């Protein structure tokens, strides 16, 4: 593979795809909260369940997207997904109605993002083999910055325009992504062939187990801060710190992953899970804002060291031909626990009156996942076990 040349425009296209998807998903949720306060219901739970469904569909539909990829091609799959997402976002502008919002936003836009996402991960492997980690790190850092830029943009440049035109404005990003998707060019049912490998099966199970409690801090820290030592007026600093540290850590992790040969890359994820679990369990104990600022940096570092490295490990495990199915099923398995977590944290908060127990319980699943990942068989160990069994 070239490991460069034309691969950089593809890197730019993938960065645009991820950034636009996650920025829109984060921005719509923020917009809904303001309108909820401004206007009374005319619903309470469905208002957040619609956003939850839209976010979760991306991961839930990945296994179906993988077969469409393998059959048609990354370019066609991404173009179709972008077109469907554009149609959904444009149609969301219709008169307010919970029933119509459910369909138009959760299903159409969610499935469009699902179809547009996985090909963005699969495509990079066709151009970068010796520098795939660096490519993924660049893509992830760009995605982080782009996603962080969305609310900071609209909250000022919206000019207090009604919610109706925000969807029209946001649809342009999907249109431009549809145009950019043509840059993808090729260079190389329900069979479940991938699950044969013990290493892949254990790795996917461990990641799924960790995902249950992985995302609780990133969702509830900004609201626990407003509830304890709320006197701090600079509470928005933590979000910027997390975003910048996540971008830097994603880039650094992407660069570092290239120097670790073979399946030794899983040790980075093991260390990330251990560190995140310990930090989440500690969060309740910190009583200094200047200290919590320190915890935010480690949260950002762990976020990168976990997210950025998944695709290269999939390529290492299952070669280049089965990477699409591997990634699709990994996302499909991850889909449910990450949606289940934060709701359980909120239920615990309602029950107990504070987030201490919520963080204590969120700290465990990451440690369990780290323990599970610590025992992934080695390449020689698999053959030794086969010989001993035969």
């Amino acid at each position, epitope marked *: 593979p070239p490991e460069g040349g034309f691969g950089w425009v593809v890197v730019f296209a993938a960065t645009w795809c991820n950034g636009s998807i996650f920025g829109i998903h984060n921005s719509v949720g923020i917009l809904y909260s303001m309108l909820l306060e401004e206007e009374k219901e005319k619903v309470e739970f469905q208002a957040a369940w619609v956003g939850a469904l839209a976010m979760g569909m991306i991961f839930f539909c990945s296994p179906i997207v993988s077969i469409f990829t393998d059959r048609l091609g990354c370019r066609i799959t991404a173009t179709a997904g972008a077109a469907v997402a554009f149609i959904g976002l444009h149609t969301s502008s219709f008169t307010s109605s919970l029933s119509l919002r459910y369909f138009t936003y959760g299903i159409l836009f969610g499935c469009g993002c699902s179809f547009a996402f996985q090909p963005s991960l699969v495509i990079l492997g066709h151009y970068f083999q010796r520098r795939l980690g660096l490519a993924n790190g660049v893509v992830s850092a760009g995605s982080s910055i782009f996603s962080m830029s969305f609310p900071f943009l609209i909250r000022m440049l919206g000019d207090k325009i009604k919610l109706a035109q925000t969807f029209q404005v946001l649809s342009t990003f999907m249109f431009v992504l549809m145009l950019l998707s043509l840059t993808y060019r090729p260079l190389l049912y329900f069979n479940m062939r991938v699950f044969r490998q013990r290493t892949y099966r254990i790795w996917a199970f461990g990641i799924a187990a960790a995902a249950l409690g992985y995302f609780v801090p990133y969702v509830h820290l900004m609201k626990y801060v407003e509830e304890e030592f709320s006197e701090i007026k600079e509470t928005w600093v933590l979000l910027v710190c997390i975003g910048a540290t996540s971008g830097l850590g994603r880039l650094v992790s992407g660069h570092i992953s290239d120097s670790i040969p073979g399946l030794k890359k899983i040790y980075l994820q093991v260390l990330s899970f251990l560190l995140l679990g310990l930090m989440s369990m500690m969060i309740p104990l910190c009583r200094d804002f200047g200290g919590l600022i320190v915890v935010c940096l480690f949260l950002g570092l762990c976020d990168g060291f976990f997210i950025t490295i998944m695709a290269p490990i999939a390529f290492e495990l299952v070669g280049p031909m089965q990477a699409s199915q591997a990634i699709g099923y990994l996302l499909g398995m991850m889909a449910l626990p990450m949606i289940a977590g934060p709701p359980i944290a909120g239920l615990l908060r309602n029950c107990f009156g504070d987030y201490h127990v919520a963080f204590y319980f969120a700290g465990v699943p990451p440690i369990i996942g780290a323990v599970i990942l610590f025992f992934v068989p*080695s*390449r*020689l*160990e698999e*053959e*030794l*076990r086969r*010989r*001993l069994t*035969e």
Partner: nanobody
Amino acid sequence: VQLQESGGGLVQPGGSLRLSCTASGVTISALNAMAMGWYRQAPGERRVMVAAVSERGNAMYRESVQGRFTVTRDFTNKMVSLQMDNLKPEDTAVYYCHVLEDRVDSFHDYWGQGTQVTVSS
């Protein structure tokens, strides 16, 4: 890689025996990326692996020998030691020193001179 020294012994039931040797025809650096193990073949039996040492040092054993025998490796010396404790008549069989290497969608295997181990009362 070449396995040369070989060994063996004879004991009564409930006895013990030990084996240890150094390989040849390979550099220590290359060998450190290769695993070591022992094979078995009693009269009328197929050749199967009984014990081995993995790249990370994890020792693995077959059911027939697991729980009685133990294996150790000296990475720098190119040596692997097999300790056979609580031997029994069924343990009588020929054993061969074995080495394995990892390769792209394939492996490289080596075999050593047969070693004689017998148990008789």
